[PDB]
């Protein structure tokens, strides 16, 4: 009964201006409304409903598909049983739900229920505030969480996960790479199959592991398993408490040990192995090699204080003195 | 008036072949066109328009919703006031706009205006050429920019940002982690709340900070604030110009200083602190410990040149000589 | 002929309950079905078809647009020539295809053909199992591959690429940054224009390059080109086999060489340059400076074994002895 309006089908209603109802009990009551299908409803302003029992009751709403429902202001729902119920909500796919304000859900059973949430992919879930999930079966449930990849999961507050099966579960955790795990508080990992599980741990490289609290493991298969350990280099190990290893295959296993160079090994407490292949097994020493593989130390200035090193020139002056004491005797 | 065509409603037109117009002034003039709603228009080839004042005028266009407009070739627009105007453009959501060629925009007020641009999320913006934004309120405005996460922003040319509130604003900058900032030219940061603000700076770890030009900070809360500084380890600091710190809690504060080991500290100019807990405060020295905590240096080969170090065996030969000069006297 | 059903147009059929067919040969045969357009077909349960030759034959299917086809269970297709044929499949855009089970494809010519695949963007491709592509022209073709950014490509099994033109082509490879390349097996790179091309290589920083097998390059423009090389610092180079460089502009070019400090250079085989500006050119030595720029070594404990270093206090005891041998002579 509205202006420039048609109502075809039994008990259909076109009361809105510029409205077009069609189908048994199709109700196009909003202004500029179009309702198609049995029991379809376009009651909002500028609303369009297509499909049996479809509902476009929000202002500026569009619902397409059987039982599709666009009840939010500025809502759009496509697919059987889709629901766009938040303000500024958009749903595309069967049984998709965009129920948060400013939410967008795309894929069968995709769910964007947080404020400002976005879920893309079948059975993706963006349930945290300001959460973003992109990938089938992905989950961004933490506040500010972002998950990208199939089965990626960002569950910590401020967590970010990128990669198939990646998991960022600690507060302020970040994981990148397939199967990467950032589970410590304030943990960061990047590399497929890498793990940063200590609090304050950071790992970089495929299969790198920073399990110590405050540990840092950088390089493929690097291991920083001690508290406060640092390991840089593929296959490096810093397993002592407060240990430091630098170089491929370096090994700092003593408490406080330091190993610098490819294949350097330091097992002594507070010891240092300096140089490729150097070995420091004695506690509280600096080794510049190993037995049979000693190194000269060069560009040493003359020592002055009692615990400074001595250079050859200082010794040669004593030798010359003894020579002359050989003439005087 | 087209073949296999129906036109129900006043002043409706079905001139295209296989065309179906329905509604006051519904115009289904394209081939294989279907126009539903008052003033709806399906004028393109293989075009489908549903909703009051909806327009599908592109070839292979589909417009659904009041005022929805699919004017590009191969364009698809769903939602009230949606607009797919580029070639190969797709828009889903109220007031979404896909105006670039090869552009895709999903979410209320989402905007994909660059060539090859993709925006997913309420009020997301992909305005750069080859730009990608995924997250409510995200922005990829640089050329080749990619932004993922709610309120993520990639504004530099070639910038990439991943995480809630992440920001990549320098040229060729990359930020990963919630609240991460890559603001220097050619800067790279990964870790929640991390910052790479120097030109050529790189930071890895939660709250790591590389503010120096050409600086590198690796580990949770690491600080590389000097020009050309390098800090690796949780809580490491390299604040001197051209300083280097390796180990948890290491501190290289002198110009040109080097601190290697957990808790090593080097404040002297061009000094080196080698070993856990070592201290180098004297300018232009290498310290292997600290006063009271001296270390032996081991596996030292006999010195040859004047500035080589001397080992015990060389001294013992002088001692034996003096012993015999004790017999001869 | 179904209950609460209307069939307007020649040879249209509304046999389903609550079904509404409209248009020449429009077939609304499913329960709660709505078919609009010439030759449109809504045969599934809870199915809705809009557009000439549109087909909604899946249960809970919705097809919109000319030739649009929703044949999968729980399938939704929007756009001319769109096809949602997998179980739980969703397609939005002209010629989009969601043919995998649990697949979601958005954008003109977007293709989600893998199981659990998700493609967003014009001409995006998610063809691997558990693959995710987000960006125009992006490709996630590996098993578990994830690609984000325009023209991003994740082609390895378990590969993850983020950034415009980023490429992760090795097994378990991860690339982040515009133009980043992770091409080695188990390679990881993060930084625009960075490359990890060795097997087991890892690179961090803009334009960092880890081309050696088992190499690690950390810092802007760092180069770890030797087998097993490690370079940390902007502009650092570790080009020797099994070489290690730490510090901005450090250079470890000898086999087994180690350079620690900004501008330290070690060209000797198995040599070590320790300290800013130190130079180690002699094979199998540890240099603490360079000629003209020698450093004292401090906090050295008295040597005990033959290859331990000697400190000044040990030499002063010999000097005092010689003094007294000067009185006795
Ligand atoms: Na070990
Ligand atoms: Na400090
Ligand atoms: Na070089």
Author numbering:
A (entry chain A), B (entry chain A), C (entry chain A): 2 to 330
List sentences quoted exactly from the publication behind this structure.
Gram‐negative pathogens like Burkholderia pseudomallei use trimeric autotransporter adhesins such as BpaC as key molecules in their pathogenicity. The TAA BpaC was first extensively described in 2013 (Campos et al., 2013); of the nine predicted B. pseudomallei TAAs, BpaC is the only one associated with all of the three features involved in pathogenicity: macrophage survival, virulence, and serum survival (Lazar Adler et al., 2015). Studies have demonstrated BpaC adhesion to respiratory epithelial cell lines, establishing the importance of BpaC in the initial attachment and tropism of the pathogen (Lafontaine et al., 2014).
Our 1.4 Å crystal structure of the membrane‐proximal part of the BpaC head domain shows that the domain is exclusively made of left‐handed parallel β‐roll repeats. Having settled on BpaC741–1054 as the region to express, we used the engineered trimeric GCN4 leucine zipper (Hernandez Alvarez et al., 2008) to preserve the DAVNxxQL neck motif at the C‐terminal end by replacing the coiled‐coil that would be in the membrane β‐barrel in the wt structure. There was a single molecule in the asymmetric unit, and the TAA trimer formed around the crystallographic threefold axis. The final model contains all of the residues in BpaC from position 14 in layer 22 to the end of layer 42 (residues 741–1021), followed by a long neck from E1022 to Q1054, the GCN4 anchor, with 282 water molecules, of which 42 are ordered in specific channels or the trimer core cavity. All three chains of the C‐terminal head domain of BpaC thread around a central hydrophilic core in a helical fashion with an average turn of 5.7° ± 0.6° for layers 23–41 and a rise of 4.8 Å ± 0.1 Å (the last one, from 1008–1021, has a turn of just 2.5°), calculated per turn, typical of other LPBRs. Instead of predominantly β‐branched hydrophobic residues (Nummelin et al., 2004) at positions 5 and 7, BpaC has T@5 almost exclusively as well as a number of hydrophilic residues with T/N/S/G@7. More surprising, however, are the “inner” and “central” chains of buried water molecules, which form because the BpaC core is uniquely hydrophilic in 15/20 of the LPBR layers, composed of repeating units of N/S/T@7. In BpaC, only negatively charged residues face the solvent—in stark contrast to the primarily positive surface charge of the left‐handed parallel β‐roll “type” protein, YadA. The pIs of the solved LPBR structures demonstrate this clearly: the pI of the LPBR is clearly correlated with its position within the passenger domain, with BpaC having a pI of about 2.3 and YadA of 9.2. The structure reported here of BpaC741–1054 contains the highest number of LPBR repeats in an experimental structure and is the longest, at 89.5 Å.
